[PDB]
Amino acid sequence: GSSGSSGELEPGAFSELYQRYRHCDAPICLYEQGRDSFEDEGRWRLILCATCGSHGTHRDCSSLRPNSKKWECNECLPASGPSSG
Ligand SMILES: [Zn+2]
Ligand SMILES: [Zn+2]
């Protein structure tokens, strides 16, 4: 038998950001442009996470529904296992 673990984190670490983060970070993109471009109203509307509100990507790009209230980034959403399988 043995004991001893090593793992710490930085609590309350939200680096302020003057400019709004609008960099498509979704899993799959359909917009021909597939860039940080969005409209005021439409599927291609820049959507910011709800939990932390840091990530920013299109609507249909984040594989969401046409009747979704708010969307949350990955790190926030319950993703079984780390992105890097
Ligand atoms: Zn996108
Ligand atoms: Zn988030």
From Swiss-Prot:
<comment type="function">
    <text>E3 ubiquitin-protein ligase which ubiquitinates histone H3 at 'Lys-14'. Required for male fertility, via inhibition of SPOP-mediated BRDT degradation when in the presence of acetylated histone H4 in early condensing spermatids. Stabilization of BRDT allows it to facilitate histone removal in early condensing spermatids and promote the progression of histone-to-protamine exchange. Promotes the expression of steroidogenesis proteins in the testes, and as a result plays a role in maintaining testosterone levels and repressing osteoclastogenesis.</text>
</comment>
<feature type="binding site">
    <location>
        <position position="76"/>
    </location>
    <ligand>
        <name>Zn(2+) 7</name>
    </ligand>
</feature>
<feature type="binding site">
    <location>
        <position position="24"/>
    </location>
    <ligand>
        <name>Zn(2+) 6</name>
    </ligand>
</feature>
<feature type="binding site">
    <location>
        <position position="29"/>
    </location>
    <ligand>
        <name>Zn(2+) 6</name>
    </ligand>
</feature>
<feature type="binding site">
    <location>
        <position position="52"/>
    </location>
    <ligand>
        <name>Zn(2+) 7</name>
    </ligand>
</feature>
<feature type="region of interest" description="Required for association with and ubiquitination of H3">
    <location>
        <begin position="20"/>
        <end position="77"/>
    </location>
</feature>
<feature type="binding site">
    <location>
        <position position="49"/>
    </location>
    <ligand>
        <name>Zn(2+) 7</name>
    </ligand>
</feature>
<feature type="binding site">
    <location>
        <position position="58"/>
    </location>
    <ligand>
        <name>Zn(2+) 6</name>
    </ligand>
</feature>
<comment type="subunit">
    <text>Interacts with MEF2C; the interaction promotes MEF2C binding to its transcription targets. Interacts with GATA4; the interaction promotes GATA4 binding to its transcription targets. Interacts with UBE2D2; the interaction inhibits cleavage of PHF7 and promotes association of the complex with the nucleosome core particle.</text>
</comment>
<protein>
    <recommendedName>
        <fullName>E3 ubiquitin-protein ligase PHF7</fullName>
    </recommendedName>
</protein>
<feature type="binding site">
    <location>
        <position position="73"/>
    </location>
    <ligand>
        <name>Zn(2+) 7</name>
    </ligand>
</feature>
<feature type="binding site">
    <location>
        <position position="61"/>
    </location>
    <ligand>
        <name>Zn(2+) 6</name>
    </ligand>
</feature>
